[PDB]
């Protein structure tokens, strides 16, 4: 530390919680972005970014696609609690990343029952649910980084 982000190089100024599942535990490890087969000349930086709506479209790889509002179904959110700095750039490999959703308790966004949606890069916006939506149907005592089972 501090501000490091490499140079030997441990903080890493980004902490993302592996929230263990419920009724038998479930995990999923941080996913890389690669198009088809496994990345050559390093695998680059993660497809997943803390505070972003992604969907796996490949087994060990995660990519773009945004879950459309209307008729309640499961997760594929992979919201991870926001890190400090780098919040409109995504998060780079060598910082803390995970996936949270799908058979486990998740990280929520938005304070009260008033919710809106998330951009990929780590920013939050307002917006009503009318062609896209993020996160489960609101419950009592739901704030940012709170544990909803979905």
């Amino acid at each position: 530390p501090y501000v490091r982000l490499g140079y030997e190089g441990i903080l890493n100024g980004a902490h993302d919680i592996d929230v263990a599942g419920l009724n038998g535990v479930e995990q999923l490890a941080g996913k890389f972005a690669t198009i088809g087969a496994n990345g050559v000349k390093l695998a680059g930086d993660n497809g997943t970014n803390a505070v972003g709506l992604f969907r796996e479209d490949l087994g060990d790889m995660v990519n773009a696609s945004e879950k459309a509002s209307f008729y309640f179904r499961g997760g594929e959110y992979y919201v991870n609690i926001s890190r400090t700095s780098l919040t409109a750039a995504g998060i780079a490999a060598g910082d803390e990343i995970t996936c949270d959703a799908d058979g486990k308790m998740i990280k929520f966004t938005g304070t009260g029952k008033a919710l809106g949606v998330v951009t990929h890069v780590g920013e939050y916006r307002a917006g009503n649910m009318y062609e896209k939506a993020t996160q489960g149907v609101t419950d009592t005592d739901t704030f940012i980084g709170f544990i909803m089972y979905v």
Partner: protein
């Protein structure tokens, strides 16, 4: 995302949606354009070839009459076979990067040509495709092998052997590993036996052309002239089809590219075409 699958972040540095070609082919095995082509119609193939004739022979004493002969033939059946390859594509990806589209077609064509040579020689048949020509043809000629003689030497030595046989030879049909190994296993001189290494000899051996077909297998060399041994009947030629009306591609943005041909094989001299396996 913040990147497509990139190494660094676009937001930090670097912009562009223009990107160069990365896709490339591996393992050529052409022999169909080398061979002659025919049209065919019909849903199965029957071929007839002539066997040896039954004539009389007199190794001792000539004054008598040789026994007469008549044209005797043996049959082969060839069912149609289907040669294909499929590609799953993402149109958004294709339109943005740019060359992928051109690469896919030219690769599919090469790929059809490649698979066809493999089944025709042999590459595991399930009794649903053209017969395994490589098996049926003449065994290993022990005579060529001078006992403890170089691999490259074997390929030179074999070429002449086919000329003694009275079968046309224009060219060497060898396996890729056997050819490399043949080049590497040369005498005690830098100069190779086919011709020196200051001449281009990568693609020619014995002063005759080299045809690389895969699945002719290691330690085997087959001399022939390709046109003569076999002939290629084509039931339907190579055609691409592209489908966004297929069930699983429709739902998605994805487009499915099929590349296929339906082929058949004729054997004009499957009862001959010399081959050897090194015993050296």
């Amino acid at each position: 995302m913040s990147q497509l699958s990139n190494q660094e972040k676009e937001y930090l540095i670097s912009k562009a949606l223009e990107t160069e070609e990365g896709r490339v082919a591996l393992a050529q095995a052409m022999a169909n354009p080398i061979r002659v082509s025919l049209d065919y119609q019909g849903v199965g193939r029957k071929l007839l070839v002539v066997d040896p004739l039954p004539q009389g022979a007199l190794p001792v004493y000539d004054k008598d009459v040789d026994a007469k002969a008549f044209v005797i033939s043996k049959r082969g059946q060839v069912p149609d076979q289907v040669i294909e390859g499929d590609r799953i594509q993402v149109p958004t990806f294709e339109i943005v990067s740019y060359p992928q589209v051109r690469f896919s077609q030219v690769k599919e064509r090469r790929f059809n040509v490649i698979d066809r040579a493999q089944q025709r020689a042999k590459a595991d048949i399930m009794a649903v495709e053209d017969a395994e020509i490589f098996s049926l043809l003449e065994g290993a000629a022990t005579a060529v092998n001078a006992v403890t003689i170089s691999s490259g030497g074997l390929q030179r030595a074999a070429l002449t052997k086919a000329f003694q046989e009275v079968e046309k030879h224009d060219l060497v049909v060898t396996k890729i590993v056997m050819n490399a190994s043949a080049f590497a296993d040369i005498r005690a001189w830098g100069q190779n036996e086919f011709d020196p290494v200051t001449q281009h000899e990568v693609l020619q051996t014995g002063l005759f052309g080299h045809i690389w077909t895969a699945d002719i297998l290691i330690s085997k060399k087959v001399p022939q002239n390709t046109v003569y041994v076999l002939a290629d009947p084509e039931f339907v030629g190579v055609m691409p089809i592209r489908q966004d009306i297929q069930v699983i591609p429709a739902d998605k943005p994805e487009e499915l590219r099929l590349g296929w041909v339906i082929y058949e094989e004729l054997g004009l001299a499957v009862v001959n075409s010399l081959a050897i396996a090194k015993i050296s």
